[PDB]
RNA sequence: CGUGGAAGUCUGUUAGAGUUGGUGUCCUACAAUACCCUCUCGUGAUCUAUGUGUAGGGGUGAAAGGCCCAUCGAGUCCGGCA
RNA sequence: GCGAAAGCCAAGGCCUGUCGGGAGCAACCAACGUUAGGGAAUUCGGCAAGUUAGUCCCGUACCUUCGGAAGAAGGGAUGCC
RNA sequence: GGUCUUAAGGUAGCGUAGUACCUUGCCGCAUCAGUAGCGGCUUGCAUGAAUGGAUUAACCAGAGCUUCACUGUCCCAACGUUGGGCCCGGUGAACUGUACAUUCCAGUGCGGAGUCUGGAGACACCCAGGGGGAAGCGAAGACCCUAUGGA
RNA sequence: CGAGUGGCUUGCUACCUCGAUGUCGGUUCCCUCCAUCCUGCCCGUGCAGAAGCGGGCAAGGGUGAGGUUGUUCGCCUAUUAAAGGAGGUCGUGAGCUGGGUUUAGACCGUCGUGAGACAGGUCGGCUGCUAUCUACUGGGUGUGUAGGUGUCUGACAAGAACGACCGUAUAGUACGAGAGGAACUACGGUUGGUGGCCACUGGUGUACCGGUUGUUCGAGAGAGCACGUGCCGGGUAGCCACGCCACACGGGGUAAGAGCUGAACGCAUCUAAGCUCGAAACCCACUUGGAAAAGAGACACCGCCGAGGUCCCGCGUACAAGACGCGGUCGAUAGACUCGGGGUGUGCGCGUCGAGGUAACGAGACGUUAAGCCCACGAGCACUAACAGACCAA
């Protein structure tokens, strides 16, 4: 009577295209509770190790015992937060007010804007102190940029750029945080928004595979038996039924596979260092030596070896924080063999 | 712990522990040791294992 | 039921024939159904390592041969993985007869069980020689 | 025990003949019956060249209405015929 | 080597089974190799593929028109110096 | 029924058959489960003696079934190899074409509409793809009936 | 007995097509319906409990694997929360299959004088086409909005991104004479689905290294061929699944239902006005897309004689064209070299030994030798090549 099966992949994650910007964008942020505090940061994915952890979890049999766990090690360094955009509510959503910059700049920040030669801060702040009396002032975000400078295994020296909301207590409160960060230098690191042990959803562009078949890209069956034999390999029975007289987008073609944009979500931060403890024998397949800020995150992140990857303090966690986990032991074994 | 094979010690967070019929263990640290057992040949035999030299 | 405390990768599919570690008087069974198991469309209903399934005698005893009965896998080839990472695979893949309260039907067992089973039927494990 | 070496005898892509499965490749083809693998026979009612005979309600047919020049439950050509 | 067999190579012939250049060369298709654990669950049906294999020694059931069945089956051996 | 039609009234055998409608007949074997297969029974819709019956060693690219072995047939797909495919130079057809044509959901209509009606959607061109629709292309239906047709 | 709804079966009719709308069954892939099999929330009970039976709301998700048969259907087995039914030209042959029906060959039974027949059985018996339009999946080029760089907004759009089960504590407790035997809640795990990733295990790996058969280059050494690796053994990177990681809760509004206050109707009444609650369903939350949203958007800075961009060059975190991303001497982008990190398994030669053999000769063993050979990775390193230079542009 033909058995019942679910559909071929997922219908949540389309259209399946090309990701439009390299470096994500997270369309959502985690709510205003403590003090106030960015609440994003981010990195440079290197490659993966293991690590033994002594079990964290109170509820777990194995609590105090030796475990072994998967983990991608990602370089973190100092970013600089260079500008504090408002935002305003209106009748047709939230519109950026106004911006304040600042004077200190990277040496390279110009390989990817016009940077301000000319600005008045104390204007921009003013006319968002104003709407926010008037009380139309809606969240408020910084202007964040890294430095592939200071991690020697990506070739680039081009800074990504991506905003970054602000969350806090009062909106004053967390206004005048905002800049006090921004006025220096914009200069903050893992440290000050992360502490290992935290759950973080890590946004990122996934590794390309180009055009792709309905079996890779959808996971549908391969023709079978005979089937399989008579000139049809990796092609679905059907576009659809005689009527509807058309093909439906619903059924599972070939197309563009790979670098999407995905935020993978509760990844437990295991550790927040720095030096090279983390680096492999050889050093990383395709990537290089990690010597400076690092982050390990546990298991996988979307991407391959040098993108941009992207962490926000988890949204919709599971679990509670169990903080700073007791890492044993940390694999340096080489990669290859 | 030490591979039963070759003599070098496994990596923790690695390695394979196969359990004979009669219950014997041995611990190996990759599938090249194991393979070069399944041919029957000893470790002691073969130069590049840290049983020979 | 209780977790096993280590991952398994079902190496046994329905229809799979496996060694009977006891003394029943069965020394041959075939899986026919794996206790609690739902698959998908196609798939083939898999057991393996800790799973209580449903089982006929293939070879042994006149009066044991043609039975169905239940069993718990005790070894499997196919490997499994423990919490510190390390890798566990079986010379053979073999169950032992079991009862409704999950009691051992034989006197005694043949060869070695894995650690996890003890935990999952303590009375069979309470019946083991070695357990690895 | 040896000798002898019979057979519409066996194995066999020797040559040569045949054409079972793949319902593969091809299917505006390399080809108006092809290609590849697989498969059957292979001293005999065997296979084959050349020459030669049988002609259309007639041949020829270990018989399938098979074959008689890509034409067959009655060839082909022209005529009867607009 | 049993061989007018395979594979390799002479003599002799040929690069005319006559369009080329580029992309680690994607999807998809034609031929095809290897796939852990399970082992016909696939399917109308083991279709397709796979297994076995040469030679010598041992050994060989039912049935039978006594010819056969039979290379039944099964077991062992096999290089070089 | 304990002869009658029309001469006789089915013997040896075989039998649910490549012949059995009822039918997946009933019992058994085998399997977890067997409309299959084999054995027995058998009143055979409608078996049967050269319209040859039964049976049978050997033989078979003949039909069905069971076992060991084997394995990507399957679980469930992966990676790789060669030739294409894709881009470039050169060569260079065919099929098909009433017209218009960016369609979709419904309705209507000779009752199976891109073109009618109402709405919805719709900036143009181009590349690659697998073939949902054009009741797609290909062939004056080989089924069926009709013709005071043919062979 | 009476009244209906559906359009899944069957029958009827003969409207449509005979200058052909390709069959049954199956398969694969997509959407849907509800008359709901499971799951959620409920009502009744001949509801103690447990297990049920019947009913209501409800289509989010699930509804699986096998033995006979071409079968649909159905019978049967073991699992299961359950293994629901139906529509889409009895969805799906310019997708597959071709077992059945229904060509030409043949047999049997029955019928017929016979040719031959059968709404009987049986063996064999073919699957064409290079996509013009449309449709959708993905990729570009342009124009519109009207100079550039970077960052955003969110009209709308998609999602199942999550479904379900087992176990423990609760508890041998409530309930019950006993037998038997729950729940709220908090935990652990599994299964199906989903997205991503390769440290681990596993596969591949006609890169590579070794062994070895036949033959050819006289031997040796070192090589070619044996189908696109002769075969065998090992296997790096990468790609992968059989491997690993992640995938709520909670709000808001409702249905069935449980109630509050409450009148028509002085009482009563969940309803008529009002209100408190209450579903896996709806909305939000979360993920993905999204300035072509014609109301065609916002912000900051740069620039209009110059901001920026293209070509060019060296390359990939990208890739069928195109596109995308990075580097370009103020440099580590690619190659060479040397290290590091890896694969294989101990090179040629020489020395000693070696069953023997007068000797010649001699398979092989040990040493030199963690040797030799090799690397799709990393580092150091400007040695080589990223030069020269062109163009558009308010
Ligand atoms: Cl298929
Ligand atoms: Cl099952
Ligand atoms: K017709
Ligand atoms: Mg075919
Ligand atoms: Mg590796
Ligand atoms: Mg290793
Ligand atoms: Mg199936
Ligand atoms: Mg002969
Ligand atoms: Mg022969
Ligand atoms: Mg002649
Ligand atoms: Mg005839
Ligand atoms: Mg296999
Ligand atoms: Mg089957
Ligand atoms: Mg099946
Ligand atoms: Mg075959
Ligand atoms: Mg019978
Ligand atoms: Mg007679
Ligand atoms: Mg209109
Ligand atoms: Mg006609
Ligand atoms: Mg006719
Ligand atoms: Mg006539
Ligand atoms: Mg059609
Ligand atoms: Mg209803
Ligand atoms: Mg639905
Ligand atoms: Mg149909
Ligand atoms: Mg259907
Ligand atoms: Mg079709
Ligand atoms: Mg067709
Ligand atoms: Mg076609
Ligand atoms: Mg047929
Ligand atoms: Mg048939
Ligand atoms: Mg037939
Ligand atoms: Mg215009
Ligand atoms: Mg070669
Ligand atoms: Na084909
Ligand atoms: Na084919
Ligand atoms: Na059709
Ligand atoms: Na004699
Ligand atoms: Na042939
Ligand atoms: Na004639
Ligand atoms: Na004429
Ligand atoms: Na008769
Ligand atoms: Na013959
Ligand atoms: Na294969
Ligand atoms: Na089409
Ligand atoms: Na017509
Ligand atoms: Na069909
Ligand atoms: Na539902
Ligand atoms: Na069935
Ligand atoms: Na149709
Ligand atoms: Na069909
Ligand atoms: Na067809
Ligand atoms: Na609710
Ligand atoms: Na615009």
């Keep these: ?337 | 712990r030490e591979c039963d094979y070759c003599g070098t010690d496994i990596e923790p967070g690695t390695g394979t522990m196969f359990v004979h019929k009669d219950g014997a263990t041995t611990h190996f640290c990759s599938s090249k040791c194991e393979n070069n057992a399944d041919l029957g040949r000893e470790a002691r035999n073969l130069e590049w294992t840290d049983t020979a030299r | ?132």
């Design chain 3, 1 to 132: 039921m209780e977790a096993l405390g280590a991952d398994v990768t079902q190496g046994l599919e329905k229809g799979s024939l496996i060694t009977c570690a006891d003394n029943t008087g069965a020394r041959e069974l075939k899986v026919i159904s794996v206790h609690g198991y739902s698959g998908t469309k196609n798939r083939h209903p898999k057991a393996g390592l800790g799973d209580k399934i449903t089982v006929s005698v293939t070879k042994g005893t006149p009066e044991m041969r043609r039975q169905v009965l239940e069993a718990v896998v005790v070894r499997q080839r196919k490997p499994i993985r423990r919490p510190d990472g390390t890798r566990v695979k079986f010379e053979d893949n073999a169950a032992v007869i079991v009862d409704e309260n999950e009691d051992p039907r034989g006197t005694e067992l043949k060869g070695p069980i894995a650690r996890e089973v003890a935990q999952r039927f303590g009375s069979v494990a309470s019946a083991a020689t070695m357990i690895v």
């Design chain 1, 1 to 337: 009577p033909q058995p019942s099966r679910p559909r071929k992949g997922s219908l949540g994650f389309g259209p399946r295209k090309r990701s439009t910007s390299e470096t994500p964008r997270f369309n959502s942020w985690p709510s205003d509770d403590g003090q106030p505090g960015v609440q994003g940061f981010a990195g440079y994915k290197a490659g993966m190790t293991h690590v033994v952890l002594v079990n964290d979890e109170p509820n777990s049999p194995r609590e105090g015992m030796e475990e072994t766990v998967p983990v991608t090690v990602i370089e973190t360094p100092p970013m600089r937060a260079v500008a504090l955009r408002a935002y305003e509510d209106t009748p047709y959503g939230q519109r950026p007010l106004t911006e304040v910059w600042t004077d200190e700049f990277h040496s390279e920040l110009d390989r990817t804007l016009d940077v301000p030669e000319d600005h008045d801060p104390d204007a921009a702040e003013e006319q968002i102190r104003d709407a926010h009396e008037a009380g139309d002032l809606g969240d408020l975000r910084l202007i964040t940029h890294t430095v592939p400078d200071a991690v020697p295994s990506v070739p680039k020296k081009k800074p990504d750029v991506m905003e970054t909301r602000v969350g806090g207590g009062s909106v004053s409160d967390r206004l005048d945080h905002a800049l006090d960060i921004v006025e220096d230098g914009g200069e903050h690191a893992m440290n000050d928004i992360f502490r290992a042990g935290e759950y973080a959803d890590v946004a990122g562009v996934t590794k390309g595979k180009g055009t792709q078949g309905p079996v890779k890209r959808w996971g549908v069956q391969k023709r079978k038996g005979k089937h399989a034999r008579q000139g049809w390999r990796r092609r679905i029975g059907n576009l659809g039924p005689w009527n509807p007289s058309r093909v439906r987008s619903t059924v599972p073609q070939q197309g563009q596979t790979g670098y999407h944009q995905r935020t993978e979500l509760n990844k437990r931060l295991i550790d927040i260092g720095e030096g090279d403890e983390p680096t492999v024998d050889g050093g990383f397949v395709n990537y290089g030596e990690v010597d400076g800020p690092y982050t390990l995150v546990k298991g996988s992140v979307p991407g391959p070896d040098k993108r941009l990857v992207r962490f926000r303090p988890a949204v919709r966690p599971n679990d509670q924080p169990r903080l700073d986990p007791e890492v044993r032991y940390v694999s340096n074994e080489s990669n290859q063999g």
